[PDB]
Design a protein around this ligand. Sequence first.
Ligand SMILES: Nc1ncnc2c1ncn2[C@@H]1O[C@H](CO)[C@@H](OP(=O)(O)O)[C@H]1O
Ligand SMILES: Nc1ncnc2c1ncn2[C@@H]1O[C@H](CO)[C@@H](OP(=O)(O)O)[C@H]1O
Lengths: 337, 335
Amino acid sequence: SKLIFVSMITRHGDRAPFANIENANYSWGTELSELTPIGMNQEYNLGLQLRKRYIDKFGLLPEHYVDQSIYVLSSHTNRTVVSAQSLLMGLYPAGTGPLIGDGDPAIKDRFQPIPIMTLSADSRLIQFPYEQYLAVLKKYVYNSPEWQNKTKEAAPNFAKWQQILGNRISGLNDVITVGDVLIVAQAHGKPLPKGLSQEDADQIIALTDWGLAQQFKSQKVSYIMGGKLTNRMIEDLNNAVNGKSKYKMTYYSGHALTLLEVMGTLGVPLDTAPGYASNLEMELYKDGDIYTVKLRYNGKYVKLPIMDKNNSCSLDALNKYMQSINEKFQKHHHHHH
Amino acid sequence: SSKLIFVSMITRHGDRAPFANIENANYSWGTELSELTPIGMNQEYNLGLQLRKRYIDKFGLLPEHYVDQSIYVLSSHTNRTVVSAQSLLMGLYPAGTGPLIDPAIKDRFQPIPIMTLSADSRLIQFPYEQYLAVLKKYVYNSPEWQNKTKEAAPNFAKWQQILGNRISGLNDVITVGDVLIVAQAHGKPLPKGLSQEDADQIIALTDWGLAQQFKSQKVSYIMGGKLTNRMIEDLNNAVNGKSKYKMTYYSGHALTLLEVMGTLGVPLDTAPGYASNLEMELYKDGDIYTVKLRYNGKYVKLPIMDKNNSCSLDALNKYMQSINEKFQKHHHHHH
Ligand SMILES: Nc1ncnc2c1ncn2[C@@H]1O[C@H](CO)[C@@H](OP(=O)(O)O)[C@H]1O
Ligand SMILES: Nc1ncnc2c1ncn2[C@@H]1O[C@H](CO)[C@@H](OP(=O)(O)O)[C@H]1O
């Protein structure tokens, strides 16, 4: 069997936060929500790892980029576009880019440009727009027994955390909001907010990780947000077999939610929120007329319920699996007055 | 005295392979149809270096190391325009200037985000079939097009038999002309039986035809009014506090340049070559704001501009407003 196609999702690299902790004076060195130099480096290094895997080891891809061999689509954010660019600088590094004339580089250092398309900001394919995402949570997650139970457990800490941090803390949603800032602060070696013990910071961060993962332990929530992309990736695999597409790889540059929603849709939800440069690959193998698929998440194969002891299933089986998921969550349409 | 505070820029992409094949030739391009070639990457990279010398070294509008959220880059939904923008930005902010953590990326590359429109957007280029539909309606039956057609028509049968491709109008001449332009740019031999004289005629008609389309301000406005308005709005946003960008950059096509120049009433006489570019420059001297328009390295005098190729931003706004009013559509109700 030979690897013939891969579809990949990444989360972007280290970024600045979206929000500020009111009672802290953190300085990030880049604008809110932008990819940091560390984040660029993380994605670049992931690119180098992917070169060793899909070029050196499997030989799916060549050492010098072939035009129209990789389709890259990013959400409409700076961090996801720059993350894809940075990753591709590792996958096809300086020294491998094209020459003109007598072996003179097209671009100094033989950089290799690889096109990245973006969705519109309004697209729901790679990420739901933030307010639409929160609306799904309000409807399907916040009143769930698991969310309410965890809320009751954590609630005795809300008043204290609110007075320490300044930011409103009146539910797990607010804990998650400030938790992201604390995660960024820790990733950048910043001091704790005054009056927030390491114990308290650890608890807030733990609740944040728990909460993000809990959202997608619902296959329904996962499908609402991720059904479209999951279907599209499987269709990419099919197009690699049916002659429709000549791409060796499709790469969707996305977010924590992108990874959570696809894993959750497939019935293998994550127990932890994806860290920076987390990544998922659907690998398609060919042995004669037999086509098989494997699913890789952060460097380890994942066993879908339909897979064998070798973490593998036929593409036909994956199709049937996805079809059943689509039917399971199909909406009953109604007419109106 | 007066200082440059903002620039809005359009480029055409760099050298590319053709869209079509000449039926009776066997050209091999080295990349897929319509993709940017290595020479095209080089052209855009070199333009980037030129833009660094101008807007960083000379005017100091931009800093030597990229500031996040300082440049907004929007490309049409094509590989050649995205790769052209990326190549240009590799010249504007070259290796050695990118961020450190020890370099964030080897050779200190500097990533700069590029957004793309959807393929169905009409902002930077009309989708091809919609573009041709505008030509059919407004250009192909115009007196100038018909006259040129009659002059060239005695050559159609011969060109058709030589090339294989259908040649029954100037539109077909333009179609094969692009292939001949690409062939010449890549030093390929002429198709058998096509003399250099004939190739020159076909290419000349192609250049003439592309420019002729946009000598109509109406045609230009239909396709380019939206982008022209948007670029002027970018200038206004640099003054009114709405935007903190130092530059907006629209990565586009020959049509993008033709339509904006044509909308502003300064249509080009020749079709834009690879890496052609246009800049709207905004200057501040106290409370006085002035604009200049640059095309392929030379200032262009709008009718509203003075001997110094300059006008106030207020004047530019009034000018654009009058163009909008001129081409406003009379709406109707229906049964
Ligand atoms: N204040 C905000 N504004 C816009 N998007 C936000 C946001 N806060 C969070 N997000 C989004 O919610 C996801 C889970 O934390 C994030 O994933 P990423 O950090 O982008 O992987 C954001 O997309
Ligand atoms: N066969 C084709 N398919 C799609 N777009 C095409 C095309 N032939 C020409 N174009 C488009 O028409 C413009 C003027 O020649 C081109 O400008 P550029 O070469 O992209 O600057 C194309 O966009």
